[PDB]
Symmetry: C3
């Protein structure tokens, strides 16, 4: 009763053997999983980096594409400017800004850069001061339809009435072209 | 005998201690791998989101670039159109769409928007039925599209509306709702 | 001579505990295997999407490049166009001549617009041929020469006008790269 049964210990040895095999398989599978995991990590880093690069490039391109959607300027510090939507090219020269009942009035000359006339252009305009959300809420906007005839190479007089802002506060202007009713001839 | 041998039991105990070591190692490794897997899953969710956004932006930007490559229109719902590739600017006005044997003929005027004459322009043209509104219908539609290159020795003087005829076989006027037209610049001459 | 009973009892207990631990570890191994499979598949998909995206972005970049400036090999080019989205110019190279410590490009420029433009400035970079290999680029760039040509040239609409570009540091036969762009600061429209 001080000592152990031989057969019981034999069974123990067999069990220890089976455990040995199991432990082996576990170690092996563990190495496999380690490899796969490392591979996954590195691939992920690569993806994140490449994505980073792509977003930067695409941001630059978007930024440059903005130039065809509209023209932004400070009418207090600009004489000549250009409006180009990829179809119609116009040049503008600001003659003067004058106060009129509640707001400002921009007198300017517009000129059709093309070889054929363009008529009945409409202008999308937003204006204000030189911030992000309220400065955007403090911007007024409108679409000016026109019957203006722009003959090729001819500086033509145009008046932009902008209510709500005095001349000395008028330091922001975003202007774009609406081509809904455009006719490529004399009106 | 009837009892277990001492030495054999010592051997077994030693192998058991060894097994204890290996087991402890396996547990530790299992835990760290668990942690790594967690991280990988979270990071993957983020990656899926971010990639979705990126694809979204790239799509728009690339679409915007297509406006200079060629001009797309429904000739049945269009009078004026513009072709501009960054070098040559042309305007066009559709006078009429006429039926021929198994096709349509478009009579139009083209005009050079620039200040110097351009000559020997070639036109890449693709035409057919209306552009399908669903993405799954795209490949079949593309396979059904008709294409050709119109070589013209037409000289376009600055500002002068000039008569041009596009013969498009394969599609009747009432089915002709897609026209894609671009400029080939290989043999273009400025003067 | 004989093994101790107590020691053996202890050994059986510990062996049983080992058995439980091993079972748990096998279970966890299965779970981890499944999760790893998921991760691998999703990541293959992602890698594909990313590959396509980079592919597209490349062509986009190399296209906005054409609005940014005009790149050419003046030894292989007669006619060319410069267009920054506002001003359109057409150029024809008449000759390239060697001068003191460089080359001179005689060319005709013509304003593609309907109004005259004046006081154009030109940003110019020039040098030896742009190499095909992409690894050679960062070194080839270092060796490029640059300058800004300020002008009082009046470009009337549709009128081919003589312009001379003096480019020091490179002989005519070695002048195979010219990058030219428009500076718009002092542009006057008369």
């Amino acid at each position: 009763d001080y000592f152990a049964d031989k057969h019981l210990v034999e069974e123990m040895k067999e069990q220890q053997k089976e455990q040995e095999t199991k432990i082996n398989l576990l170690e092996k599978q563990q190495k496999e999983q380690e490899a796969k995991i490392n591979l996954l990590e590195k691939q992920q880093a690569t993806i994140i980096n490449t994505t980073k690069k792509v977003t930067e490039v695409v941001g630059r391109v978007e930024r440059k594409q903005r130039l065809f959607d509209y023209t932004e300027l400070d009418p207090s510090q600009t004489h000549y400017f250009i409006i180009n939507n990829g179809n119609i090219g116009l040049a503008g020269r600001i003659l003067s800004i004058e106060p009129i009942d509640n707001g400002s009035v921009i007198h300017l000359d517009l000129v059709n850069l093309l070889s054929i006339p363009v008529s009945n252009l409409a202008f999308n305009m937003t204006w204000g001061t030189k911030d992000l959300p309220r400065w955007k809420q403090l911007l007024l906007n409108t679409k000016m339809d026109s019957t203006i005839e722009l003959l090729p190479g001819a500086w033509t007089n145009v008046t932009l009435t902008l209510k709500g802002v005095s001349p000395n506060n008028l330091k922001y202007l975003k202007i774009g072209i609406d081509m809904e009713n455009v006719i490529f001839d004399s009106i």
